[PDB]
Amino acid sequence: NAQAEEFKKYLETNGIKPKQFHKKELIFNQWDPQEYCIFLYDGITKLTSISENGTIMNLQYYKGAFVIMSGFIDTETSVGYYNLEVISEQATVYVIKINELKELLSKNLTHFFYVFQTLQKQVSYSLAKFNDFSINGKLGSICGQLLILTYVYGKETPDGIKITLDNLTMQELGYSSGIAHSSAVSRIISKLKQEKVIVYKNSCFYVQNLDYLKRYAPKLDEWFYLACPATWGKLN
Amino acid sequence: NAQAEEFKKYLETNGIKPKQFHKKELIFNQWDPQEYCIFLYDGITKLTSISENGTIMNLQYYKGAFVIMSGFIDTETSVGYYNLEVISEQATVYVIKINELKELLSKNLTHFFYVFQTLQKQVSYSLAKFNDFSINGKLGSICGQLLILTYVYGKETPDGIKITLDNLTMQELGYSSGIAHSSAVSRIISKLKQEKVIVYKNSCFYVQNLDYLKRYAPKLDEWFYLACPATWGKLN
DNA sequence: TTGAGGCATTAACATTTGTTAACGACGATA
DNA sequence: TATCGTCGTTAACAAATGTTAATGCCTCAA
After folding, report:
1. Strand pairing partners for B79?
2. What share of chain A is helix, strand, coil (3-state, %, to 5)?
3. What is the domain count for chain B?
4. Domain span at residue B104?
5. Residue A32 sits in a domain of what CATH number?
6. Which among A70, A93, A108 is the end of a domain?
7. Is B67 at the interface with chain A, CB within 8 A?
8. Cα angle at B73 between B70 and B75, to 5 degrees?
9. Cα(first)–Cα(last) distance of chain B, in Å?
10. How far, in Å, CA of B217 to CA of B231, rounded?
11. For the domain that residue A207 is a member of, what is the CATH number?
12. Torsions phi, psi of A209, nearest 5?
Protein backbone atom coordinates (compact mmCIF):
# COMPACT_ATOMS: atom_id res chain seq x y z
CA ASN A 1 0.00 0.00 0.00
CA ALA A 2 2.71 2.47 1.05
CA GLN A 3 5.77 0.88 -0.56
CA ALA A 4 3.64 0.69 -3.73
CA GLU A 5 2.26 4.25 -3.71
CA GLU A 6 5.83 5.48 -3.25
CA PHE A 7 6.66 3.43 -6.35
CA LYS A 8 3.84 5.13 -8.26
CA LYS A 9 5.35 8.59 -7.74
CA TYR A 10 8.73 7.38 -9.01
CA LEU A 11 6.99 6.28 -12.22
CA GLU A 12 5.15 9.56 -12.85
CA THR A 13 8.38 11.55 -12.35
CA ASN A 14 9.97 9.52 -15.20
CA GLY A 15 7.30 10.04 -17.87
CA ILE A 16 5.50 6.73 -17.33
CA LYS A 17 1.82 7.66 -17.74
CA PRO A 18 -1.02 5.49 -16.38
CA LYS A 19 -3.05 3.79 -19.11
CA GLN A 20 -6.52 2.83 -17.89
CA PHE A 21 -8.08 -0.44 -19.07
CA HIS A 22 -11.72 -1.52 -18.86
CA LYS A 23 -13.29 -4.93 -18.37
CA LYS A 24 -12.50 -7.93 -20.61
CA GLU A 25 -9.64 -6.36 -22.61
CA LEU A 26 -6.19 -7.95 -22.52
CA ILE A 27 -3.19 -5.93 -21.34
CA PHE A 28 -0.79 -8.46 -22.87
CA ASN A 29 -1.64 -11.73 -24.60
CA GLN A 30 -0.11 -15.04 -25.64
CA TRP A 31 -0.30 -14.47 -29.42
CA ASP A 32 1.57 -11.12 -29.53
CA PRO A 33 4.43 -11.70 -27.06
CA GLN A 34 5.66 -8.23 -26.11
CA GLU A 35 8.01 -7.95 -23.15
CA TYR A 36 6.66 -5.40 -20.59
CA CYS A 37 6.76 -4.82 -16.83
CA ILE A 38 3.11 -4.34 -15.88
CA PHE A 39 2.54 -2.53 -12.58
CA LEU A 40 -1.14 -2.97 -11.79
CA TYR A 41 -1.93 -0.07 -9.46
CA ASP A 42 -5.70 -0.34 -8.89
CA GLY A 43 -7.79 -3.10 -10.41
CA ILE A 44 -8.35 -6.84 -10.65
CA THR A 45 -6.99 -9.10 -13.39
CA LYS A 46 -6.51 -12.80 -14.09
CA LEU A 47 -3.54 -14.55 -15.70
CA THR A 48 -4.73 -17.13 -18.23
CA SER A 49 -3.44 -19.40 -20.97
CA ILE A 50 -5.30 -21.15 -23.81
CA SER A 51 -4.09 -24.56 -24.94
CA GLU A 52 -3.96 -25.54 -28.60
CA ASN A 53 -7.21 -27.46 -28.03
CA GLY A 54 -8.86 -24.24 -26.84
CA THR A 55 -8.73 -25.47 -23.24
CA ILE A 56 -8.71 -22.54 -20.81
CA MET A 57 -6.58 -22.35 -17.67
CA ASN A 58 -6.68 -19.61 -15.02
CA LEU A 59 -3.27 -19.57 -13.35
CA GLN A 60 -4.08 -16.91 -10.73
CA TYR A 61 -5.57 -13.48 -10.05
CA TYR A 62 -3.82 -10.16 -9.48
CA LYS A 63 -5.19 -7.35 -7.30
CA GLY A 64 -3.33 -4.05 -7.33
CA ALA A 65 -0.88 -2.95 -6.31
CA PHE A 66 1.33 -5.69 -7.77
CA VAL A 67 3.96 -6.32 -10.44
CA ILE A 68 3.71 -8.75 -13.37
CA MET A 69 6.61 -9.60 -15.69
CA SER A 70 6.06 -10.70 -19.29
CA GLY A 71 9.77 -10.69 -20.17
CA PHE A 72 13.14 -11.17 -18.54
CA ILE A 73 15.10 -8.16 -17.33
CA ASP A 74 18.42 -9.28 -18.86
CA THR A 75 17.73 -11.09 -22.14
CA GLU A 76 14.48 -9.10 -22.58
CA THR A 77 12.83 -12.31 -23.81
CA SER A 78 9.39 -13.70 -23.04
CA VAL A 79 8.92 -15.54 -19.74
CA GLY A 80 5.97 -17.42 -21.23
CA TYR A 81 2.98 -16.89 -23.51
CA TYR A 82 0.15 -15.85 -21.18
CA ASN A 83 -2.82 -13.47 -21.15
CA LEU A 84 -3.65 -10.86 -18.50
CA GLU A 85 -7.38 -10.20 -18.78
CA VAL A 86 -9.10 -7.38 -16.89
CA ILE A 87 -12.08 -8.64 -14.87
CA SER A 88 -12.82 -5.55 -12.78
CA GLU A 89 -15.04 -2.84 -14.23
CA GLN A 90 -12.04 -0.50 -14.45
CA ALA A 91 -8.33 -1.04 -13.80
CA THR A 92 -5.54 1.53 -14.07
CA VAL A 93 -2.09 0.27 -15.04
CA TYR A 94 1.42 1.72 -15.41
CA VAL A 95 2.89 -0.28 -18.30
CA ILE A 96 6.68 -0.21 -18.69
CA LYS A 97 8.76 -1.52 -21.57
CA ILE A 98 11.27 -4.17 -20.53
CA ASN A 99 14.17 -2.09 -21.87
CA GLU A 100 13.80 1.03 -19.71
CA LEU A 101 12.99 -1.11 -16.65
CA LYS A 102 16.62 -2.19 -16.21
CA GLU A 103 17.54 1.51 -16.12
CA LEU A 104 14.81 2.82 -13.81
CA LEU A 105 15.62 0.09 -11.26
CA SER A 106 19.40 0.63 -11.29
CA LYS A 107 18.82 4.26 -10.22
CA ASN A 108 16.48 3.96 -7.22
CA LEU A 109 17.56 1.09 -4.97
CA THR A 110 14.57 1.09 -2.60
CA HIS A 111 12.20 0.44 -5.52
CA PHE A 112 14.42 -2.32 -6.90
CA PHE A 113 13.78 -4.16 -3.63
CA TYR A 114 10.04 -3.50 -3.98
CA VAL A 115 9.86 -5.22 -7.37
CA PHE A 116 12.20 -7.89 -5.99
CA GLN A 117 9.93 -8.26 -2.95
CA THR A 118 6.80 -8.77 -5.05
CA LEU A 119 8.64 -11.35 -7.15
CA GLN A 120 9.43 -13.29 -3.97
CA LYS A 121 5.74 -13.01 -3.05
CA GLN A 122 5.00 -14.53 -6.46
CA VAL A 123 7.33 -17.52 -5.95
CA SER A 124 6.08 -18.45 -2.48
CA TYR A 125 2.50 -18.16 -3.73
CA SER A 126 3.08 -20.56 -6.62
CA LEU A 127 4.82 -23.21 -4.50
CA ALA A 128 2.07 -23.13 -1.87
CA LYS A 129 -0.72 -23.33 -4.45
CA PHE A 130 1.15 -26.17 -6.16
CA ASN A 131 1.62 -27.99 -2.85
CA ASP A 132 -2.08 -28.03 -1.94
CA PHE A 133 -3.56 -28.58 -5.42
CA SER A 134 -1.57 -31.82 -5.81
CA ILE A 135 -2.22 -33.71 -2.55
CA ASN A 136 -6.04 -33.88 -2.34
CA GLY A 137 -7.05 -34.07 -6.00
CA LYS A 138 -9.71 -31.70 -7.29
CA LEU A 139 -11.72 -31.39 -4.07
CA GLY A 140 -8.62 -29.88 -2.50
CA SER A 141 -8.06 -27.71 -5.57
CA ILE A 142 -11.50 -26.09 -5.30
CA CYS A 143 -11.02 -25.71 -1.54
CA GLY A 144 -7.62 -24.10 -2.04
CA GLN A 145 -8.88 -21.72 -4.71
CA LEU A 146 -11.85 -20.76 -2.53
CA LEU A 147 -9.51 -20.14 0.42
CA ILE A 148 -7.49 -17.74 -1.74
CA LEU A 149 -10.66 -15.92 -2.78
CA THR A 150 -11.92 -15.50 0.79
CA TYR A 151 -8.73 -13.85 2.03
CA VAL A 152 -8.20 -11.25 -0.72
CA TYR A 153 -11.85 -10.73 -1.78
CA GLY A 154 -13.74 -11.63 1.41
CA LYS A 155 -15.74 -9.54 3.86
CA GLU A 156 -17.47 -10.72 7.03
CA THR A 157 -21.27 -10.55 7.16
CA PRO A 158 -23.93 -12.18 9.34
CA ASP A 159 -24.35 -14.81 6.62
CA GLY A 160 -20.62 -15.62 6.60
CA ILE A 161 -17.64 -14.29 4.63
CA LYS A 162 -18.94 -12.71 1.43
CA ILE A 163 -16.68 -13.17 -1.60
CA THR A 164 -17.21 -9.90 -3.48
CA LEU A 165 -16.80 -11.02 -7.10
CA ASP A 166 -19.14 -10.66 -10.04
CA ASN A 167 -19.26 -13.52 -12.54
CA LEU A 168 -17.39 -16.23 -10.59
CA THR A 169 -19.40 -18.93 -12.33
CA MET A 170 -18.90 -22.68 -12.02
CA GLN A 171 -16.97 -22.50 -15.30
CA GLU A 172 -14.50 -19.94 -13.94
CA LEU A 173 -13.76 -21.84 -10.73
CA GLY A 174 -13.07 -24.93 -12.82
CA TYR A 175 -10.55 -23.02 -14.94
CA SER A 176 -8.67 -21.91 -11.81
CA SER A 177 -8.44 -25.53 -10.58
CA GLY A 178 -8.00 -27.49 -13.82
CA ILE A 179 -11.59 -28.74 -14.16
CA ALA A 180 -12.85 -28.65 -17.74
CA HIS A 181 -16.59 -29.30 -17.29
CA SER A 182 -18.97 -27.17 -15.24
CA SER A 183 -20.94 -30.21 -14.06
CA ALA A 184 -17.87 -31.54 -12.23
CA VAL A 185 -17.40 -28.22 -10.41
CA SER A 186 -21.04 -28.14 -9.32
CA ARG A 187 -20.84 -31.73 -8.05
CA ILE A 188 -18.02 -30.67 -5.70
CA ILE A 189 -19.68 -27.44 -4.56
CA SER A 190 -22.89 -29.37 -3.88
CA LYS A 191 -20.83 -31.47 -1.46
CA LEU A 192 -19.56 -28.32 0.28
CA LYS A 193 -23.13 -27.08 0.69
CA GLN A 194 -24.10 -30.46 2.14
CA GLU A 195 -21.09 -30.40 4.47
CA LYS A 196 -22.27 -26.88 5.45
CA VAL A 197 -18.98 -25.26 4.41
CA ILE A 198 -20.45 -22.72 1.95
CA VAL A 199 -23.83 -21.40 0.80
CA TYR A 200 -25.07 -19.87 -2.46
CA LYS A 201 -26.82 -16.53 -1.83
CA ASN A 202 -27.35 -13.62 -4.24
CA SER A 203 -25.33 -15.31 -7.01
CA CYS A 204 -22.56 -14.87 -4.44
CA PHE A 205 -20.53 -17.26 -2.28
CA TYR A 206 -20.50 -17.11 1.53
CA VAL A 207 -18.09 -19.42 3.39
CA GLN A 208 -18.99 -20.38 6.96
CA ASN A 209 -16.38 -23.05 7.86
CA LEU A 210 -13.04 -21.46 6.97
CA ASP A 211 -11.18 -24.09 8.99
CA TYR A 212 -12.46 -26.81 6.64
CA LEU A 213 -10.65 -25.08 3.78
CA LYS A 214 -7.44 -24.76 5.81
CA ARG A 215 -7.30 -28.54 6.24
CA TYR A 216 -7.26 -28.82 2.43
CA ALA A 217 -4.97 -25.80 1.80
CA PRO A 218 -2.61 -25.55 4.78
CA LYS A 219 0.32 -24.26 2.71
CA LEU A 220 -1.80 -21.48 1.19
CA ASP A 221 -3.05 -20.38 4.59
CA GLU A 222 0.59 -20.47 5.68
CA TRP A 223 1.44 -18.16 2.76
CA PHE A 224 -1.10 -15.46 3.65
CA TYR A 225 0.30 -15.42 7.20
CA LEU A 226 3.90 -14.92 6.01
CA ALA A 227 3.40 -12.89 2.79
CA CYS A 228 0.22 -10.81 3.21
CA PRO A 229 -0.15 -10.80 7.02
CA ALA A 230 -2.61 -7.88 7.01
CA THR A 231 -5.03 -9.77 4.75
CA TRP A 232 -4.62 -12.76 7.07
CA GLY A 233 -5.49 -10.73 10.16
CA LYS A 234 -8.92 -9.68 8.89
CA LEU A 235 -10.08 -13.31 9.27
CA ASN A 236 -7.97 -14.48 12.23
CA ASN B 1 27.67 -20.56 -16.31
CA ALA B 2 29.50 -17.24 -16.62
CA GLN B 3 27.18 -15.17 -14.41
CA ALA B 4 27.36 -17.88 -11.73
CA GLU B 5 31.18 -17.81 -11.80
CA GLU B 6 31.50 -14.03 -11.50
CA PHE B 7 29.00 -14.30 -8.64
CA LYS B 8 31.01 -17.11 -7.03
CA LYS B 9 34.18 -15.00 -7.09
CA TYR B 10 32.17 -12.06 -5.71
CA LEU B 11 31.13 -14.08 -2.65
CA GLU B 12 34.64 -15.44 -2.03
CA THR B 13 35.96 -11.87 -2.14
CA ASN B 14 33.60 -10.65 0.60
CA GLY B 15 34.49 -13.44 3.04
CA ILE B 16 31.80 -15.98 2.11
CA LYS B 17 33.43 -19.38 1.62
CA PRO B 18 31.75 -22.62 0.51
CA LYS B 19 30.34 -25.37 2.69
CA GLN B 20 30.26 -29.06 1.78
CA PHE B 21 27.02 -30.99 2.29
CA HIS B 22 26.68 -34.73 1.68
CA LYS B 23 23.68 -36.69 0.46
CA LYS B 24 20.63 -36.86 2.76
CA GLU B 25 21.53 -33.59 4.54
CA LEU B 26 19.21 -30.58 4.74
CA ILE B 27 20.53 -27.11 3.95
CA PHE B 28 17.48 -25.69 5.71
CA ASN B 29 14.37 -27.39 7.06
CA GLN B 30 10.70 -26.63 7.67
CA TRP B 31 10.91 -26.99 11.47
CA ASP B 32 13.79 -24.57 12.23
CA PRO B 33 13.05 -21.62 9.91
CA GLN B 34 16.28 -19.73 9.28
CA GLU B 35 16.20 -17.06 6.57
CA TYR B 36 19.19 -17.72 4.31
CA CYS B 37 20.05 -17.03 0.70
CA ILE B 38 21.29 -20.39 -0.60
CA PHE B 39 23.60 -20.19 -3.62
CA LEU B 40 23.68 -23.79 -4.79
CA TYR B 41 26.86 -23.70 -6.89
CA ASP B 42 27.46 -27.40 -7.62
CA GLY B 43 25.19 -30.32 -6.75
CA ILE B 44 21.59 -31.46 -6.94
CA THR B 45 18.86 -30.88 -4.35
CA LYS B 46 15.08 -31.23 -4.02
CA LEU B 47 12.75 -28.80 -2.25
CA THR B 48 10.22 -30.70 -0.15
CA SER B 49 7.52 -30.21 2.47
CA ILE B 50 6.06 -32.67 4.97
CA SER B 51 2.39 -32.21 5.78
CA GLU B 52 1.18 -32.44 9.37
CA ASN B 53 -0.01 -36.02 8.74
CA GLY B 54 3.29 -37.13 7.19
CA THR B 55 2.68 -37.04 3.42
CA ILE B 56 5.78 -36.01 1.46
CA MET B 57 5.61 -33.51 -1.40
CA ASN B 58 8.49 -32.99 -3.84
CA LEU B 59 8.07 -29.43 -5.10
CA GLN B 60 11.00 -29.38 -7.53
CA TYR B 61 14.68 -30.17 -8.01
CA TYR B 62 17.57 -27.70 -8.04
CA LYS B 63 20.76 -28.19 -10.05
CA GLY B 64 23.64 -25.80 -9.42
CA ALA B 65 24.34 -23.11 -10.21
CA PHE B 66 21.11 -21.55 -8.92
CA VAL B 67 19.74 -19.31 -6.15
CA ILE B 68 17.22 -20.43 -3.52
CA MET B 69 15.98 -18.22 -0.69
CA SER B 70 14.13 -19.06 2.52
CA GLY B 71 13.38 -15.46 3.55
CA PHE B 72 12.23 -12.21 1.99
CA ILE B 73 14.80 -9.58 1.08
CA ASP B 74 13.54 -6.49 2.93
CA THR B 75 11.50 -7.86 5.86
CA GLU B 76 13.90 -10.83 6.20
CA THR B 77 10.91 -12.98 7.23
CA SER B 78 10.34 -16.55 6.09
CA VAL B 79 8.86 -17.10 2.63
CA GLY B 80 7.61 -20.56 3.61
CA TYR B 81 8.55 -23.67 5.55
CA TYR B 82 10.33 -26.04 3.17
CA ASN B 83 13.21 -28.50 3.30
CA LEU B 84 16.11 -28.42 0.83
CA GLU B 85 17.51 -31.95 0.81
CA VAL B 86 20.78 -32.85 -0.92
CA ILE B 87 20.18 -35.84 -3.19
CA SER B 88 23.49 -35.90 -5.07
CA GLU B 89 26.46 -37.56 -3.39
CA GLN B 90 27.81 -34.11 -2.45
CA ALA B 91 26.98 -30.45 -3.03
CA THR B 92 28.92 -27.19 -2.75
CA VAL B 93 26.76 -24.47 -1.17
CA TYR B 94 27.43 -20.81 -0.37
CA VAL B 95 25.26 -19.89 2.62
CA ILE B 96 24.87 -16.15 3.23
CA LYS B 97 22.82 -14.39 5.88
CA ILE B 98 19.79 -12.60 4.45
CA ASN B 99 20.96 -9.26 5.86
CA GLU B 100 24.47 -9.43 4.38
CA LEU B 101 22.87 -10.04 0.98
CA LYS B 102 21.15 -6.64 0.92
CA GLU B 103 24.53 -4.91 1.21
CA LEU B 104 26.33 -7.14 -1.30
CA LEU B 105 23.82 -6.75 -4.14
CA SER B 106 23.71 -3.04 -3.28
CA LYS B 107 27.41 -2.66 -4.13
CA ASN B 108 27.28 -4.51 -7.48
CA LEU B 109 24.20 -4.34 -9.71
CA THR B 110 25.23 -6.87 -12.37
CA HIS B 111 24.95 -9.51 -9.64
CA PHE B 112 21.65 -8.04 -8.45
CA PHE B 113 20.18 -8.57 -11.92
CA TYR B 114 21.60 -12.11 -11.94
CA VAL B 115 19.67 -12.92 -8.76
CA PHE B 116 16.66 -11.19 -10.32
CA GLN B 117 17.06 -13.34 -13.44
CA THR B 118 17.11 -16.60 -11.47
CA LEU B 119 13.94 -15.46 -9.68
CA GLN B 120 12.20 -14.75 -12.98
CA LYS B 121 13.25 -18.27 -14.00
CA GLN B 122 11.57 -19.53 -10.82
CA VAL B 123 8.27 -17.70 -11.39
CA SER B 124 7.82 -18.75 -15.02
CA TYR B 125 8.84 -22.29 -14.05
CA SER B 126 6.19 -22.59 -11.33
CA LEU B 127 3.40 -21.17 -13.50
CA ALA B 128 4.31 -23.54 -16.34
CA LYS B 129 4.54 -26.57 -14.05
CA PHE B 130 1.23 -25.64 -12.41
CA ASN B 131 -0.31 -25.32 -15.88
CA ASP B 132 0.60 -28.78 -17.18
CA PHE B 133 -0.01 -30.63 -13.90
CA SER B 134 -3.55 -29.27 -13.47
CA ILE B 135 -5.00 -30.08 -16.90
CA ASN B 136 -4.42 -33.81 -17.52
CA GLY B 137 -4.55 -35.26 -14.01
CA LYS B 138 -1.89 -37.62 -12.71
CA LEU B 139 -0.96 -39.02 -16.12
CA GLY B 140 -0.09 -35.48 -17.21
CA SER B 141 1.76 -34.85 -13.96
CA ILE B 142 4.00 -37.92 -14.32
CA CYS B 143 4.57 -37.04 -17.98
CA GLY B 144 5.45 -33.48 -16.99
CA GLN B 145 7.94 -34.49 -14.30
CA LEU B 146 9.64 -36.91 -16.69
CA LEU B 147 9.92 -34.15 -19.29
CA ILE B 148 11.64 -31.91 -16.73
CA LEU B 149 14.10 -34.65 -15.75
CA THR B 150 15.03 -35.47 -19.36
CA TYR B 151 16.04 -31.93 -20.32
CA VAL B 152 18.02 -31.51 -17.09
CA TYR B 153 19.39 -35.02 -16.46
CA GLY B 154 18.99 -36.62 -19.90
CA LYS B 155 21.59 -37.73 -22.44
CA GLU B 156 21.23 -39.19 -25.92
CA THR B 157 21.94 -42.93 -25.86
CA PRO B 158 21.37 -45.85 -28.26
CA ASP B 159 18.27 -46.76 -26.21
CA GLY B 160 16.76 -43.27 -26.44
CA ILE B 161 17.41 -40.66 -23.73
CA LYS B 162 18.76 -41.92 -20.41
CA ILE B 163 17.70 -40.04 -17.27
CA THR B 164 21.04 -39.91 -15.45
CA LEU B 165 19.53 -39.76 -11.97
CA ASP B 166 20.24 -42.12 -9.07
CA ASN B 167 17.69 -43.39 -6.55
CA LEU B 168 14.71 -42.31 -8.68
CA THR B 169 12.24 -44.73 -7.14
CA MET B 170 8.50 -44.85 -7.78
CA GLN B 171 7.96 -43.03 -4.47
CA GLU B 172 10.06 -40.07 -5.58
CA LEU B 173 8.08 -39.80 -8.82
CA GLY B 174 4.85 -39.92 -6.83
CA TYR B 175 6.00 -37.28 -4.34
CA SER B 176 6.71 -34.97 -7.28
CA SER B 177 3.24 -35.63 -8.76
CA GLY B 178 1.24 -35.58 -5.52
CA ILE B 179 0.78 -39.35 -5.78
CA ALA B 180 0.88 -41.00 -2.36
CA HIS B 181 1.02 -44.73 -3.17
CA SER B 182 3.72 -46.31 -5.33
CA SER B 183 1.02 -48.59 -6.78
CA ALA B 184 -0.60 -45.71 -8.67
CA VAL B 185 2.65 -44.49 -10.25
CA SER B 186 3.60 -48.03 -11.28
CA ARG B 187 0.20 -48.32 -12.96
CA ILE B 188 0.86 -45.14 -14.95
CA ILE B 189 4.39 -46.31 -15.79
CA SER B 190 3.29 -49.75 -16.99
CA LYS B 191 0.97 -47.88 -19.37
CA LEU B 192 3.81 -45.66 -20.61
CA LYS B 193 5.90 -48.79 -21.21
CA GLN B 194 2.92 -50.38 -22.97
CA GLU B 195 2.64 -47.40 -25.33
CA LYS B 196 6.42 -47.61 -25.96
CA VAL B 197 7.02 -44.18 -24.42
CA ILE B 198 9.70 -45.20 -21.89
CA VAL B 199 11.72 -48.29 -20.96
CA TYR B 200 13.01 -49.42 -17.55
CA LYS B 201 16.69 -50.42 -17.70
CA ASN B 202 19.15 -50.84 -14.81
CA SER B 203 16.91 -49.02 -12.31
CA CYS B 204 16.90 -46.08 -14.77
CA PHE B 205 14.28 -44.76 -17.18
CA TYR B 206 14.97 -44.44 -20.91
CA VAL B 207 12.70 -42.09 -22.87
CA GLN B 208 12.00 -43.14 -26.46
CA ASN B 209 8.97 -40.94 -27.33
CA LEU B 210 9.70 -37.37 -26.25
CA ASP B 211 6.86 -35.95 -28.37
CA TYR B 212 4.35 -37.92 -26.29
CA LEU B 213 5.54 -36.01 -23.22
CA LYS B 214 5.32 -32.64 -25.00
CA ARG B 215 1.63 -33.06 -25.81
CA TYR B 216 0.98 -33.63 -22.08
CA ALA B 217 3.32 -30.85 -20.87
CA PRO B 218 3.37 -28.23 -23.65
CA LYS B 219 4.02 -25.15 -21.49
CA LEU B 220 6.96 -26.78 -19.69
CA ASP B 221 8.60 -27.56 -23.03
CA GLU B 222 7.80 -23.94 -23.89
CA TRP B 223 9.48 -22.80 -20.66
CA PHE B 224 12.73 -24.67 -21.35
CA TYR B 225 12.71 -23.10 -24.82
CA LEU B 226 12.23 -19.56 -23.47
CA ALA B 227 14.21 -19.87 -20.20
CA CYS B 228 16.94 -22.51 -20.72
CA PRO B 229 17.57 -22.47 -24.49
CA ALA B 230 20.92 -24.28 -24.30
CA THR B 231 19.42 -27.16 -22.30
CA TRP B 232 16.45 -27.40 -24.68
CA GLY B 233 18.51 -27.29 -27.88
CA LYS B 234 20.39 -30.46 -26.93
CA LEU B 235 17.28 -32.58 -27.62
CA ASN B 236 15.85 -31.12 -30.84
C1' DT C 1 -46.99 -12.93 -23.77
C1' DT C 2 -43.90 -16.37 -26.32
C1' DG C 3 -39.61 -18.18 -27.40
C1' DA C 4 -34.16 -18.34 -27.50
C1' DG C 5 -29.86 -18.68 -25.03
C1' DG C 6 -26.93 -19.27 -20.81
C1' DC C 7 -26.26 -20.99 -16.32
C1' DA C 8 -26.90 -24.29 -12.44
C1' DT C 9 -28.26 -28.85 -10.93
C1' DT C 10 -28.65 -33.59 -11.21
C1' DA C 11 -28.26 -37.97 -13.36
C1' DA C 12 -25.83 -41.92 -15.57
C1' DC C 13 -22.12 -43.89 -17.44
C1' DA C 14 -17.09 -44.44 -18.48
C1' DT C 15 -12.43 -43.65 -17.07
C1' DT C 16 -9.11 -42.61 -13.85
C1' DT C 17 -7.16 -42.67 -9.52
C1' DG C 18 -7.09 -43.97 -4.28
C1' DT C 19 -6.30 -47.90 -1.41
C1' DT C 20 -4.77 -52.37 0.23
C1' DA C 21 -3.02 -56.80 -0.49
C1' DA C 22 -0.37 -60.62 -2.62
C1' DC C 23 3.38 -62.28 -5.43
C1' DG C 24 8.06 -62.47 -6.97
C1' DA C 25 12.83 -60.44 -7.77
C1' DC C 26 16.78 -58.46 -5.64
C1' DG C 27 20.22 -57.28 -2.22
C1' DA C 28 22.30 -57.81 2.22
C1' DT C 29 23.30 -60.14 6.46
C1' DA C 30 25.00 -64.12 9.29
C1' DT D 1 22.84 -71.62 2.32
C1' DA D 2 18.69 -69.71 4.56
C1' DT D 3 16.56 -65.68 6.18
C1' DC D 4 15.09 -61.06 6.43
C1' DG D 5 13.52 -56.58 4.50
C1' DT D 6 12.97 -53.22 0.09
C1' DC D 7 11.11 -52.46 -4.28
C1' DG D 8 8.44 -53.22 -8.57
C1' DT D 9 4.35 -55.50 -10.52
C1' DT D 10 -0.18 -56.84 -10.72
C1' DA D 11 -4.77 -57.56 -8.89
C1' DA D 12 -9.06 -56.32 -6.74
C1' DC D 13 -12.05 -53.15 -4.91
C1' DA D 14 -13.74 -48.43 -3.44
C1' DA D 15 -13.76 -43.62 -4.43
C1' DA D 16 -13.14 -39.67 -7.23
C1' DT D 17 -13.24 -37.48 -11.59
C1' DG D 18 -14.17 -37.03 -16.76
C1' DT D 19 -18.08 -36.66 -20.09
C1' DT D 20 -22.54 -36.28 -21.80
C1' DA D 21 -27.22 -35.41 -21.57
C1' DA D 22 -31.60 -33.89 -19.54
C1' DT D 23 -33.91 -30.75 -16.65
C1' DG D 24 -35.39 -26.33 -14.49
C1' DC D 25 -34.48 -21.29 -13.35
C1' DC D 26 -33.44 -17.01 -14.99
C1' DT D 27 -32.64 -13.15 -18.30
C1' DC D 28 -33.52 -10.91 -22.45
C1' DA D 29 -35.64 -9.54 -26.95
C1' DA D 30 -39.68 -8.71 -29.68
Report:
1. none
2. 45, 25, 30
3. 2
4. 1-108
5. 2.60.120.10
6. A108
7. no
8. 95
9. 22
10. 17
11. 1.10.10.10
12. -125, 75
